[PDB]
Design a protein around this ligand. Structure first.
Ligand code: HEM
Ligand SMILES: *[C@@H]1O[C@H](CO)[C@@H](O)[C@H](O)[C@H]1NC(C)=O
Length: 439
């Protein structure tokens, strides 16, 4: 198969990888007028995977992608069942299943009023704002913006790191069907794991849904001073290499919780001390599979974030089904010295989380419920793994094995990641936007 890269919305396959991003959540007021605007908007602004892989000289100053919720499709008279079990009811109706404290959800996510989302990516505020204004001007009164959430990469040497300090966006699946660089340790999967209607997708899709994908969007607020204080209060006293200072033990505990050091070095490869050069090297930073630590936790806890969300050899071999693409971006200001010293969050910051898959229940939702929330996953281990400490949502939030020298010790971890809302969207192919959605 040859994927039509010019017809696939770029954030799905390639990722915008821009320094700034805005999510404009909207409701449709006038379906006919919306469709009329869409037919002029799409060819001019919707950015394909082909554009994202081209030289920067051939790229627009901002990229735009567009997804619809179930109620958005219904509002537009797009009534065919897309074949996904969770998409029709929306994420609010699924939130309790995910383990969410519903009291922390906020409008306009607390229902199914949201009809869709424009994602705008750009390396600069000015261009982000101009392309946002272009949407407002093009669509006019045919839509109402019900929320805009804006994110930004962190500054300086923290570019690409999320707010707890950890380098993000290292490990992504690679799909067959196009010409791409594959790094050592990177999963290679059929395109239908990500793209609806392609090989590997087992969902029952309308023909017009070919080369779309489902987005799980999550708005997470992060509690950074609290996370930092917890690592200091529970600093690991020693590892195989020797005794740790409190600061070293706190850094190590953070790395044990994630499965990677802040630099990106995976603990399976660097189990006792950071290796920043390894973290920065994509030829090496993903080249592990837990095969050296299937039945012990010295090299990596069973319940570390990355191991829970991608179990690699814990599954007994390569498995296509549960991989997904991520295109998340941090939001909010840096954490001040005063904030860190107090140990108490004073500003709103976090992650605008974006995960793409053909089957919501096999990607985001499987990683969340079957794996992260599941105290007995990974299976068949000599010590109960417990709840994933970063995003696991089962109480008590108890995780074992964080101390490599006392693996039976359990850690009860306060929740540092608060879901504030989210939605399930479908991003059609570019042709489907104008030939089906706007018909
Ligand atoms: C604020 C919340 C979150 C933060 C701060 C966070 C942070 C990170 C970091 C630092 C990494 C390691 C870098 C990498 O491998 O790319 C990572 C990996 C990953 N995360 Fe998260 N994450 C969050 C939420 C989630 C959620 C909710 C899920 C899914 C339910 C998820 C799924 C994944 C996956 C699939 C990987 C790659 C694993 C691999 O292939 O080895 N993350 N995340
Ligand atoms: C390692 O730490 C222990 C206390 O936990 C201490 O007794 C020992 O002297 C330390 N080792 C050295 C010599 O650094």
């Amino acid at each position: 198969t040859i994927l039509p890269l010019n017809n696939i919305q770029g954030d799905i396959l390639v990722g915008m990888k821009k320094q700034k991003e805005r999510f404009v959540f909207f409701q449709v007021n006038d379906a006919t007028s919306f469709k009329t605007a869409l037919k002029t908007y799409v060819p001019e602004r919707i950015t394909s995977a082909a554009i994202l892989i081209s030289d920067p000289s051939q790229q627009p100053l901002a990229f735009v992608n567009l997804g619809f919720s179930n109620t958005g499709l219904q509002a537009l008279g797009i009534t065919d069942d897309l074949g996904d079990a969770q998409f029709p009811d929306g994420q609010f109706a699924d939130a309790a299943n995910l383990g969410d404290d519903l009291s922390q959800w906020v409008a306009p996510f607390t229902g199914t009023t949201i009809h869709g989302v424009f994602l705008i990516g750009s390396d600069q505020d000015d261009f982000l704002d101009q392309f946002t204004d272009d949407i407002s001007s093009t669509f006019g009164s045919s839509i109402t913006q019900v929320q805009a959430l804006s994110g930004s990469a962190r500054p300086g040497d923290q570019a690409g790191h999320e707010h707890f300090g950890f380098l993000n966006g290292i490990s992504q699946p690679s799909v067959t069907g196009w010409e791409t660089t594959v790094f050592p340790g990177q999963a290679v999967v059929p395109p239908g794991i990500i793209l609806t209607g392609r090989d590997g997708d087992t969902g029952t899709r309308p023909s017009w849904a070919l080369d779309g994908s489902f987005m799980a969007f999550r708005h997470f607020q992060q509690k950074v001073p609290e996370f930092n204080a917890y690592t200091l209060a529970n600093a690991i006293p020693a590892n195989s290499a020797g005794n740790l200072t409190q600061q070293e033990g706190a850094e190590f505990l953070g790395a044990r919780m994630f499965g990677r050091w802040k630099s990106g070095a995976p603990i399976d490869l660097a189990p006792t001390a950071d290796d920043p050069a390894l973290g920065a090297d994509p030829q090496r930073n993903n080249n592990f599979d837990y095969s050296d630590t299937l039945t012990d936790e010295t090299r990596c806890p069973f319940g570390a974030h990355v191991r829970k969300t991608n179990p690699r050899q814990d599954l007994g071999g390569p498995v296509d089904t549960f991989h997904a693409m991520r295109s998340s971006i941090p939001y909010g200001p840096e954490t001040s010295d005063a904030e860190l010293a107090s140990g108490v969050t004073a500003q709103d910051r976090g992650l605008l989380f974006v995960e793409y898959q053909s089957i919501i229940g096999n990607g985001f939702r499987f990683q969340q419920i079957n794996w992260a929330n599941n105290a007995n996953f990974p299976f068949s281990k000599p010590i109960t793994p417990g709840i994933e400490p970063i995003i696991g949502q089962t109480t008590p939030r108890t995780v074992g094995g964080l101390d490599p020298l006392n693996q039976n010790e359990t850690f009860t971890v306060p929740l540092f990641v608060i879901p504030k809302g989210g939605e399930y969207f479908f991003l059609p192919s570019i042709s489907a936007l104008t030939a089906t959605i706007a018909a």
